[PDB]
Swiss-Prot record:
The gene is NMB. It comes from the Eukaryota. This is Neuromedin-B. The modification Methionine amide is found at residue 10. The chain holds residues 47 to 56 of 121 of the full protein.
Length: 10
């Protein structure tokens, strides 16, 4: 799970 991408794209 990359919450990461939840802050890079959104």
């Amino acid at each position: 799970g990359n919450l990461w991408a939840t802050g890079h794209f959104m």
